[PDB]
Write a protein that binds this ligand. Sequence first.
Ligand SMILES: [Mg+2]
Ligand SMILES: [Mg+2]
Ligand SMILES: [Mg+2]
Ligand SMILES: [Mg+2]
Ligand SMILES: [Mg+2]
Ligand SMILES: [Mg+2]
Ligand SMILES: [Mg+2]
Ligand SMILES: [Mg+2]
Ligand SMILES: [Mg+2]
Ligand SMILES: [Mg+2]
Ligand SMILES: [Mg+2]
Ligand SMILES: [Mg+2]
Ligand SMILES: [Mg+2]
Ligand SMILES: [Mg+2]
Ligand SMILES: [Mg+2]
Ligand SMILES: [Mg+2]
Ligand SMILES: [Mg+2]
Ligand SMILES: [Mg+2]
Ligand SMILES: [Mg+2]
Ligand SMILES: [Mg+2]
Ligand SMILES: [Mg+2]
Ligand SMILES: [Mg+2]
Ligand SMILES: [Mg+2]
Ligand SMILES: [Mg+2]
Ligand SMILES: [Mg+2]
Ligand SMILES: [Mg+2]
Ligand SMILES: [Mg+2]
Ligand SMILES: [Mg+2]
Ligand SMILES: [Mg+2]
Ligand SMILES: [Mg+2]
Ligand SMILES: [Mg+2]
Ligand SMILES: [Mg+2]
Ligand SMILES: [Mg+2]
Ligand SMILES: [Mg+2]
Ligand SMILES: [Mg+2]
Ligand SMILES: [Mg+2]
Ligand SMILES: [Mg+2]
Ligand SMILES: [Mg+2]
Ligand SMILES: [Mg+2]
Ligand SMILES: [Mg+2]
Ligand SMILES: [Mg+2]
Ligand SMILES: [Mg+2]
Ligand SMILES: [Mg+2]
Ligand SMILES: [Mg+2]
Ligand SMILES: [Mg+2]
Ligand SMILES: [Mg+2]
Ligand SMILES: [Mg+2]
Ligand SMILES: [Mg+2]
Ligand SMILES: [Mg+2]
Ligand SMILES: [Mg+2]
Ligand SMILES: [Mg+2]
Ligand SMILES: [Mg+2]
Ligand SMILES: [Mg+2]
Ligand SMILES: [Mg+2]
Ligand SMILES: [Mg+2]
Ligand SMILES: [Mg+2]
Ligand SMILES: [Mg+2]
Ligand SMILES: [Mg+2]
Ligand SMILES: [Mg+2]
Ligand SMILES: [Mg+2]
Ligand SMILES: [Mg+2]
Ligand SMILES: [Mg+2]
Ligand SMILES: [Mg+2]
Ligand SMILES: [Mg+2]
Lengths: 49, 236, 156, 250, 119, 64, 126
Amino acid sequence: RRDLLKKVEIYRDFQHEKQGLPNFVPYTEKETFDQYFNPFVHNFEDLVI
Amino acid sequence: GGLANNGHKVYKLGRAHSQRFHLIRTQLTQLVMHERITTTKTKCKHLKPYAERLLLNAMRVAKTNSNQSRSFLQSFLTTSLARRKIVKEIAARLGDKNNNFINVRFLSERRKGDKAEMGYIEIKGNELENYEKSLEREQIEKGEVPDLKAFKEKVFKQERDFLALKLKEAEENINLKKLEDVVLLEKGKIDVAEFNRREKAAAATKAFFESKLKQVEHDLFICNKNKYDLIKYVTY
Amino acid sequence: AIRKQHAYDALSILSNIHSKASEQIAQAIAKTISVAKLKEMDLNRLFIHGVIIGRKKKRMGLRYHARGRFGIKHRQTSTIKVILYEKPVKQLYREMLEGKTAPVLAYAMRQRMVSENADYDEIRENQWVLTSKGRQQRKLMLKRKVLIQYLQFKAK
Amino acid sequence: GYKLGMTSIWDKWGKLHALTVIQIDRCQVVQVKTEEKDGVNALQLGVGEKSLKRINKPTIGHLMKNDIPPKRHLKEFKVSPDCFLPAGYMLSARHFVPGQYVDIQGISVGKGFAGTVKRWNFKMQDATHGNSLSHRAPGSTGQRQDPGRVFKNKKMAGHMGCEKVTIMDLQVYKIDVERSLVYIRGHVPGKPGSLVQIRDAFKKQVQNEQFLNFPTFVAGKNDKLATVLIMEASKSDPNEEYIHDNDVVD
Amino acid sequence: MVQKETNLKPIDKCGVWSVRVFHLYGGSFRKHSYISNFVKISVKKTRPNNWVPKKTKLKAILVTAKNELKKIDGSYVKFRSINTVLLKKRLTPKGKILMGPVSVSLKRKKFLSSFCGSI
Amino acid sequence: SKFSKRQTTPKILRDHRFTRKGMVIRKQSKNYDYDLTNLAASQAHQSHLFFNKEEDFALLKKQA
Amino acid sequence: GRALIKEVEQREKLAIDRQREFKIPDFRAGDIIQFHFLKSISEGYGNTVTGMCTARYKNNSLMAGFDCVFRFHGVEVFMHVKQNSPLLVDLKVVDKSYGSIRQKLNYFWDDRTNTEQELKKAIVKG
RNA sequence: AACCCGUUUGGCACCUCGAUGUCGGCUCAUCACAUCCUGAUGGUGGACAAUCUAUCAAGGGUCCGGCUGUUCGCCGGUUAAAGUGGUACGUGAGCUGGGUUUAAAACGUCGUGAGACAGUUUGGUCCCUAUCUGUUGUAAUUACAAGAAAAUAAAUAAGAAUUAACUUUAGUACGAGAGGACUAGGAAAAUUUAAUCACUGGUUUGAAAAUUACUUUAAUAAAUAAAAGUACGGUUUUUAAGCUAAAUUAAACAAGAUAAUUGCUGAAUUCUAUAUAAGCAAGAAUCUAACUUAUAUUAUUUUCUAAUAAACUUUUUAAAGACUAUAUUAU
RNA sequence: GCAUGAAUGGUGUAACGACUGCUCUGCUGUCUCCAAUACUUGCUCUACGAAAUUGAACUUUCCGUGAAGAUGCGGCAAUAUUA
RNA sequence: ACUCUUAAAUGUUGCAAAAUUUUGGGAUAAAUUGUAAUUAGGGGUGAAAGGCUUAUCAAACUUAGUUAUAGCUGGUUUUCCAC
RNA sequence: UACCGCGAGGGAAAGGUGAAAAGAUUUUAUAAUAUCUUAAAAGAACCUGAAAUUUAGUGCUAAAUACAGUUAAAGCUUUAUUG
Ligand SMILES: [Mg+2]
Ligand SMILES: [Mg+2]
Ligand SMILES: [Mg+2]
Ligand SMILES: [Mg+2]
Ligand SMILES: [Mg+2]
Ligand SMILES: [Mg+2]
Ligand SMILES: [Mg+2]
Ligand SMILES: [Mg+2]
Ligand SMILES: [Mg+2]
Ligand SMILES: [Mg+2]
Ligand SMILES: [Mg+2]
Ligand SMILES: [Mg+2]
Ligand SMILES: [Mg+2]
Ligand SMILES: [Mg+2]
Ligand SMILES: [Mg+2]
Ligand SMILES: [Mg+2]
Ligand SMILES: [Mg+2]
Ligand SMILES: [Mg+2]
Ligand SMILES: [Mg+2]
Ligand SMILES: [Mg+2]
Ligand SMILES: [Mg+2]
Ligand SMILES: [Mg+2]
Ligand SMILES: [Mg+2]
Ligand SMILES: [Mg+2]
Ligand SMILES: [Mg+2]
Ligand SMILES: [Mg+2]
Ligand SMILES: [Mg+2]
Ligand SMILES: [Mg+2]
Ligand SMILES: [Mg+2]
Ligand SMILES: [Mg+2]
Ligand SMILES: [Mg+2]
Ligand SMILES: [Mg+2]
Ligand SMILES: [Mg+2]
Ligand SMILES: [Mg+2]
Ligand SMILES: [Mg+2]
Ligand SMILES: [Mg+2]
Ligand SMILES: [Mg+2]
Ligand SMILES: [Mg+2]
Ligand SMILES: [Mg+2]
Ligand SMILES: [Mg+2]
Ligand SMILES: [Mg+2]
Ligand SMILES: [Mg+2]
Ligand SMILES: [Mg+2]
Ligand SMILES: [Mg+2]
Ligand SMILES: [Mg+2]
Ligand SMILES: [Mg+2]
Ligand SMILES: [Mg+2]
Ligand SMILES: [Mg+2]
Ligand SMILES: [Mg+2]
Ligand SMILES: [Mg+2]
Ligand SMILES: [Mg+2]
Ligand SMILES: [Mg+2]
Ligand SMILES: [Mg+2]
Ligand SMILES: [Mg+2]
Ligand SMILES: [Mg+2]
Ligand SMILES: [Mg+2]
Ligand SMILES: [Mg+2]
Ligand SMILES: [Mg+2]
Ligand SMILES: [Mg+2]
Ligand SMILES: [Mg+2]
Ligand SMILES: [Mg+2]
Ligand SMILES: [Mg+2]
Ligand SMILES: [Mg+2]
Ligand SMILES: [Mg+2]
């Protein structure tokens, strides 16, 4: 076991420090639901009062 | 330097008070008749204080017969010989000394039976302490003995004379190589970049032979250093 | 304690034990050295191979006890075989030039150097046998001279 | 500091205050340590003397940067970056003022293989009632089959002393400066000639707020400084602090 | 220093001569009772036909002592005998007369002024 | 005694690598930059024996 | 070391003795002694007692003290004084002793009960 | 009436019959919570106070003494309280042996008789040098990163004394009155614990004074004087230095998360409801963080290093100490 | 008088007791509360050198397990090695 | 002194197969003791306890019947093949 | 027989040189081993000389794991590798 667990590495950040390998892109975006409750997003000719 | 009993050290020796003070008086009456005893290391090192006081109160008696001192003299000595011995035979031999009358020196060997340390008291101007010192003198002068302090001074002095002529051959070779390499060859036909590595590396040779010439001379002062001198600190 | 040591070094290593058992041994190595002289060897080259031990005989008796009991006490003897080998002179210097000379070989060389009042020049020559620090140079100088050649190949 | 010994002095109101003496012997900074590089914000210091023939070579270069002499001990003190000091700065008894309460570290005295009674104040067994060879013994170490073993941190004999300890909440009574001493109203761990490592009290910043000057005592220019200094006695007399009349049984 | 089963010698003029302790006040556990501390008392010896008869369960303060009564300066005081004051309800001794001195280390202003003098 | 004074927790929860800040994978990378010009007397000649990044990595890449 | 501690204890003794309202006389055991010992400095009430000095301790140092025995309100009593203390206000000798006597007597508390007339009279031998 | 626990009285007869065990007491402990007090809270036929009941809660604490062989129990007195129990009804290779189960003897009763008793009474012997586990302490050898001399952090664990008169708020609120608070604070003392030895007290085979009997140094020249031994260190008394307690000094509040429990708005259940389902807030002597001490588990900084960094052996001494190790010291 | 009783002798009795039971004064480290000291023993080196015992042995905690109370089986774990 | 051994501690593979140390009983008498001798196995002797009788006593020691008996415990020696 | 027991009486241990003493010369702070005698030293409690026990020499060798072994894989090895 110990020989195996000697070969494991953990990080808190979104990176690893190794080089020559890839990194997961983080997902920071957050969906703007603005098109549902806002006329300023739409064009005025599509709308109606 | 013991905090317990007034700064002094104490040896129980498996003996209580009266059983110990009989040991003192016997050894001290023996330490004047024969003026040399071979014992263990602790019996030889338990008795130095009692004796160093024992002789003052004999030396005082010679100069000034004092009731206070002769009373000390009757207590620790049993016989009448030993009482009359040191006042006239010992105390006349010492000649106005107060400080230290007595030596204690240990031994490298141990007994055959018990394998115990050993050591001997001697009153300081004993005959055997003089005879033994004449032999060491005579053999070192004339016989089978090295006389190291000549061999040591010899070797640092052959060394000192040997470093200098390597220093002399350095200042020469620096100059001859410098004047050649700075004058004739800066005209061309060289790399002047390495010109720093010429002097910079050669001068280190001088510094080497010069830094070692400190060690040897310090190794000679220290061989000719009197007791009543200071300490000589050294570069590094 | 005495294994892979020079023979005269063993006695030095052995007088510091302060026992009967020590002295019983040194009477045996001093025998074996006497045989080697008799056999025309170079005692300056005489290392140790093995000191072998074994029981010989037991003499019983009685050690009494309380309440009529008794035990059996055995005084006993032993045997001491000793073996030595003189290294060839060539193998003795395969070691020194690496820096593993026996101290006893230097104690003699130091004691020789003083009896005849030697000079400074004789010491710089014989400094690779003469002290530990001087014998640490030789283990280091020697590591440098091989490496100069290792680099002479590594270029290619 | 180097402890020296003890005294005791009568205060204004007659009370005999025990006092413990400490001598700062050339306490001097050696190295500043910052969190960025060195991992922590702290100092170390150096006190005492050492002859030039017991000194080691790397100790020299460790000292010789900031141009300071050799020492006999070296210890750290966590501090804040606001309250750093320079290197080579020498510290004085003026760093403390009498009235504030002080912490101490140090090593205790040494008794040896202390017996069982001496080490935990066990009770004896009853001598002279048919007792057979267990007068000072501990007695039972444990129970039978369950648990079936002796537990840990259990009370037994052993080396008592030479233990690193602290003693909180100790006053500073007075100061001398020309003879760089400090006097403390109480006891400290260790026979004299023993190091002692003192600091302000974590346990109370309230009481000592008056008596506290950061980072340490600057002298101030063109002013007359006192070489010796005490604190103010209590406002009340111990001989006059009486018991209340109704503090009575029935 | 006072313990259970100490014989005492009161000074209040109630006819009592010698007297014993069997309880100590001031906490759950007391193994000792120093000055200005209370005790209970049985009576053992009296003037005859006394209105304080034998075997009466009383309270008391103890006043003096034979041990070193410390003072703050380092000095200390020491008597030849222990002395007590037998009590009704509170600090209200039986005999109106007190008959003797006191140590100042008991610290009760009204209770001291009743006496001759205190060291 | 060590044998008897121990604590029988698992190593995994005693382990020093794990901290409040993070896991201590190997070590810190250290920039061994040395001023090879402002040297002392007895180390001037042997300046070539000192580590220098811009030279050594040139050599590995040269030999490699 | 400790010697540094003593030289502070000596200067401070001198600072007091040269400042006290009175001076120290040369008295011995066997000599009578008065003194006004206080109870508090806020209120200078005290007591004056005549008594027979049984011992002296640490004379000519900072913890100097002595012992007396006297009879206060008809009650024999013992007290141990710190000589250089502030609570003393007076110190006086009434009757002198005479002759060879021991430095520390102690047989007036232990091994004996005393009267007035033995305490107001010094040791006198011819 | 439905389940639980395994502390009592018992049923069975699975382990041990090829050296041992019974109750109680001294010393020493550890665990549970189904909590005696302290701490928090709901309810009340709860005005205040005192008290009753239930829940959450194991941090620390939980008496001396008389009679008895005695746990128990009665009694005297007290306290914040004098908890219920388990651990081969904890603890006999750690102590005792009083009770009870051997031999002697006596009374009573039964028995022709030897003798017997879930009756009494006086007396009354088992031992041990600790191989391993376990534990309190102490070191050695070795490993890690180039090698070495020093200083620290980080991480985990262990540890931490409880109570409160009296007093201020306040004789206020409450109350016909008697009486008498919540809240927020200060705080003597007792018990326990740690560090220390300037003072005090004890100790003193270390130092000294006085002194009795016999003997002796050494004395059939005397006299004076000194000195030694033996008699518990001869006895009594004083005392340096150290150790020591009877002595000295002193032993935090707050903050964060939560347990029973308190609350804001507001639906399901068309509500001036509901502390919850989205969501926003409180709540303890506990737990955490912090503080203290220790540690071959990982890591950092400083400085030096072979034409010379280091360490080990030996001596002296100790304030350190079984040995060692640490400290100190010599060349 | 559960189940006393007259030569298995009944009742009482000054003196004597290394006899059994209770009480008092004095005394005191038995105890509150234990401390310091001397020698011996002990620990270190050295010479000599026993005893009962012992399947083998590289000999760990807890719960569970089970010929019914586990160092040795099971299950999560502990220990650089030894004195 | 001598003789006996009440009480405690020590010791328990001890100095000792019943002692050491301290204490204690009797001490002109029913006393203590030396030398040599008698009494002998269901008998001896016994100020009686089932004690003593060469460290052995609800019936000695030695030899012999005798290789006592045992429905009891403990043990029963090399290999392969079948039921 | 020795030893034990006051006594009757009980009651062990213990073999081997070589054909022939030719029983070991000489060197050596002192050869078990060269040399000499002899077929060989089989070297004096001396034929052969097992096992338990035990020492040394050369190999691989640890740092967690255990009725102390088995089956399998990988690694290093004395010309002893047959570990
Ligand atoms: Mg001894
Ligand atoms: Mg004597
Ligand atoms: Mg044997
Ligand atoms: Mg010590
Ligand atoms: Mg105590
Ligand atoms: Mg007790
Ligand atoms: Mg016994
Ligand atoms: Mg005893
Ligand atoms: Mg179990
Ligand atoms: Mg267990
Ligand atoms: Mg004086
Ligand atoms: Mg006194
Ligand atoms: Mg059965
Ligand atoms: Mg069973
Ligand atoms: Mg059977
Ligand atoms: Mg069995
Ligand atoms: Mg609960
Ligand atoms: Mg509890
Ligand atoms: Mg807590
Ligand atoms: Mg009674
Ligand atoms: Mg009783
Ligand atoms: Mg009650
Ligand atoms: Mg049992
Ligand atoms: Mg039990
Ligand atoms: Mg047991
Ligand atoms: Mg009948
Ligand atoms: Mg009796
Ligand atoms: Mg062991
Ligand atoms: Mg075991
Ligand atoms: Mg303490
Ligand atoms: Mg003291
Ligand atoms: Mg004293
Ligand atoms: Mg004395
Ligand atoms: Mg005399
Ligand atoms: Mg005599
Ligand atoms: Mg003292
Ligand atoms: Mg909160
Ligand atoms: Mg609603
Ligand atoms: Mg609502
Ligand atoms: Mg009848
Ligand atoms: Mg009858
Ligand atoms: Mg009739
Ligand atoms: Mg009869
Ligand atoms: Mg009759
Ligand atoms: Mg009658
Ligand atoms: Mg009668
Ligand atoms: Mg009798
Ligand atoms: Mg009766
Ligand atoms: Mg105590
Ligand atoms: Mg193991
Ligand atoms: Mg189990
Ligand atoms: Mg299985
Ligand atoms: Mg298992
Ligand atoms: Mg007698
Ligand atoms: Mg009598
Ligand atoms: Mg009589
Ligand atoms: Mg009978
Ligand atoms: Mg018999
Ligand atoms: Mg028969
Ligand atoms: Mg037949
Ligand atoms: Mg039959
Ligand atoms: Mg031939
Ligand atoms: Mg031949
Ligand atoms: Mg043979």
